[PDB]
Amino acid sequence: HYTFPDFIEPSGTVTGDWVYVRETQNHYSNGPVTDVTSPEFRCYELDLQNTAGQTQTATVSAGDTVGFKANSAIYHPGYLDVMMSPASPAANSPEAGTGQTWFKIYEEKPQFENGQLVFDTTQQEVTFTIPKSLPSGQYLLRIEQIALHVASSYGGAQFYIGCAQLNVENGGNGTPGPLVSIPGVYTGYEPGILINIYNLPKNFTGYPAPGPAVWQG
């Protein structure tokens, strides 16, 4: 149970709560979204229609390292990913990211050792690189942790999400892919989402990361 209220800007400053990140519904409860088919799986805003317009947009350069800071240690075992979408008409529009335009730029997978998965549950700041070749333009940047501590049953996986609003400058001519929709990216039946992390399947050879591969940009 945690939120991602703070955008970490290119020079390493942790910005204010919900300044550049769309304030989420769980701003107080810290509870997860658990229905991957729901529209609110996209950015989980306090107000899906009003929150974007109350959120500022951060200017960055393609190639910059940026991040999020969680309100506590990211204490559930899971998979973490960061996905991006061009934001049309702009980063502060609620209609941004409603099409098949999302691509993955970063992930942190559990390790696999001795027939057991290995997790890091002590991280609070998550940082990563905005790809150098990413074209200039407005983008949504979505952090997602899939917490798997009770994921053995359908709808058991817990998703902790935040969407930052970006204005990306000094971009290249890359073509991000593969592309997915959110919701749409998951069914809930994926082997990395519906999973018993404590007693793994017989032919388990490593954590299968769900959704698109990381775009090499």
Add this chain to the structure above:
Amino acid sequence: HYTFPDFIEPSGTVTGDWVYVRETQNHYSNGPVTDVTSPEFRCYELDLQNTAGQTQTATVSAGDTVGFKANSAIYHPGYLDVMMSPASPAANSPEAGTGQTWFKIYEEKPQFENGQLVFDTTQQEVTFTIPKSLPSGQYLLRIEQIALHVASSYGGAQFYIGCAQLNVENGGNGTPGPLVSIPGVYTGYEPGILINIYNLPKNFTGYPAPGPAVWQG
């Protein structure tokens, strides 16, 4: 989130919901006790004063195999124990087991190998032997699973509890010990209760079972 509504009698019959097991407060929620100091940590009854009187008492013999069936798979990782107390004035008295009279008879313990804890989260029926040397008389039989999936913080451990009411016949001359009170047995600071199962401390040699040593009778 599970309950232990069904007593498994000596012949292997899984008995009806709450017949010999005191109906618990989470009879619908399946939610856990989290305050080890609370009086209801004892048997977690729907009504601490009324439930015992509405619960039947199972006649068994010392040496018999008995147990509990949970209402689903016991799917959280943790530590399971079974404790007993002589029940005065009777097994159906709410006053039973209010003293320092509890002893451990059984456990299911997580394993430690290569720096990782190993759990079994697939069991639904828990069976065990009532020690052959146990003195004849009325007893409470308390099953407890300490779920550790979120136990890294104080009060994070989740306790799933059921108390069966027994009339033990054909007993022996054993003297059960060591003895504890419930509440009283735990403080919540035990290294087996206040614990990050995913990222274990430097000087961690193996899972330290909380509470008293198993009484081998």
